[PDB]
Amino acid sequence: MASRILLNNGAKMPILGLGTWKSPPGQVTEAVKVAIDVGYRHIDCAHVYQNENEVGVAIQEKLREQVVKREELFIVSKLWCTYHEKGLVKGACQKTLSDLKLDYLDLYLIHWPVGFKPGKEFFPLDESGNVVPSDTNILDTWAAMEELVDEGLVKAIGISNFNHLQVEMILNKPGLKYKPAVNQIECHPYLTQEKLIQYCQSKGIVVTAYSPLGSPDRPWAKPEDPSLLEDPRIKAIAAKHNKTTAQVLIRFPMQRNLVVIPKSVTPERIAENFKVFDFELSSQDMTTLLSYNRNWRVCALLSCTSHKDYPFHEEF
Ligand SMILES: NC(=O)c1ccc[n+]([C@@H]2O[C@H](COP(=O)([O-])OP(=O)(O)OC[C@H]3O[C@@H](n4cnc5c(N)ncnc54)[C@H](OP(=O)(O)O)[C@@H]3O)[C@@H](O)[C@H]2O)c1
Ligand SMILES: O=C(O)COc1cc(Cl)ccc1C(=O)NCc1cccc([N+](=O)[O-])c1
């Protein structure tokens, strides 16, 4: 299948990208260099991941080496929750641009719909462990994102972890100038997201699937927790196709017209994860994988459950 999807800003986005959350700063430069050498042209980044400088070293070296042209890369980053205020958005973007060694981003996302009190801490808490909110709403934050397009800092803007009512809130924003191009959400066979994906696709918003392997390195993993990579049912589909379980989990979202961003710092896995354009899952395989949905979420924080804009109280 085609390697890129057309966005509603007229630009093409590679459907496979490299994730970078948890990639250690002393490993991620090599990881990104390896990824570009073996064909990745999309890197998913964020200021909160604390490794954009090191990601940037890799990107710059491959540009300098003329392995790739800047126009051929699709670099994504995200506005952290403590920068939702109007007056902080441009500087947050510029800090990311500086760390990544870029003069524009292809896509910049509102990372989470929830805004937090600005300051040095990424998760400001009160004395009982609740996050301290920002009174800035998603529509004013969106207007600030729109300004970044008009200043040439970003080619496209989008959202991440927005539920359908929140997406609808931006789509219905008075004076909306740019529609979100992308909603990046968690999506895998245990959280299949049929309702939110159809909503977004029906609006011409491209959906990016994060944690496609179930984030086995997430820091809050429990023993109890389901494991996609070890699910014998998925292992059997992989065996049938002479592919790895990871490769099935990556191809699955691709065939739903999603973008997918598996993370690895292991060079052999980075290469393996890209070798997903030479096989097809059957319609039966797809429906079978969809059937494993358990509404199981890697990413959701108890500290944020009372924030006005917490996204996961809603069904979708
Ligand atoms: N927008 C958001 O709020 C949000 C939230 C979560 C994630 N994301 C983005 O989505 C990315 C992907 O999600 P994720 O990092 O949570 O988890 P993931 O991609 O589902 O899983 C990454 C884990 O899988 C292992 N792995 C990778 N390829 C493998 C393979 N072929 N075989 C066996 N194990 C393999 C990795 O190990 P090694 O690295 O040790 O190889 C790592 O432990 C993130 O890195 C981030 O860029 C965005
Ligand atoms: O968010 C990501 O991309 C991945 O997860 C990260 C990454 C880092 Cl570096 C730090 C913390 C997290 C995390 O707890 N994310 C979950 C989260 C955050 C904010 C709000 C919520 N929420 O539920 O409103 C949830």
From Swiss-Prot:
PTM annotation (N-acetylalanine): residues: 2
Binding-site residues, NADP(+): 10-19, 211-273
Phosphoprotein keyword on record: yes
N6-acetyllysine modifications at: 95, 222, 263
Means of activity regulation: Cys-299 may regulate the kinetic and inhibition properties of the enzyme, but does not participate in catalysis. Tolrestat inhibits retinal reduction.
UniProt-reported outcome of changing residue 111 to N: Reduced glyceraldehyde oxidoreductase activity
Active site feature: 49
EC class name: oxidoreductase
MF (Gene Ontology): aldose reductase (NADPH) activity; all-trans-retinol dehydrogenase (NADP+) activity; allyl-alcohol dehydrogenase activity; electron transfer activity; glyceraldehyde oxidoreductase activity; glycerol dehydrogenase (NADP+) activity; L-glucuronate reductase activity; prostaglandin H2 endoperoxidase reductase activity
UniProt record, GO biological process: C21-steroid hormone biosynthetic process; carbohydrate metabolic process; cellular hyperosmotic salinity response; daunorubicin metabolic process; doxorubicin metabolic process; epithelial cell maturation; fructose biosynthetic process; metanephric collecting duct development
Signal sequence bounds: none
Domain of life according to the entry: Eukaryota
CDD domains, per the entry: AKR_AKR1B1-19
Tissue: Highly expressed in embryonic epithelial cells (EUE) in response to osmotic stress.
Residue list for modification Phosphoserine: 3
Quaternary organization: Monomer.
Name of the protein described by the UniProt record: Aldo-keto reductase family 1 member B1
Species of the source: Homo sapiens (Human)
Gene name, Swiss-Prot/TrEMBL: AKR1B1
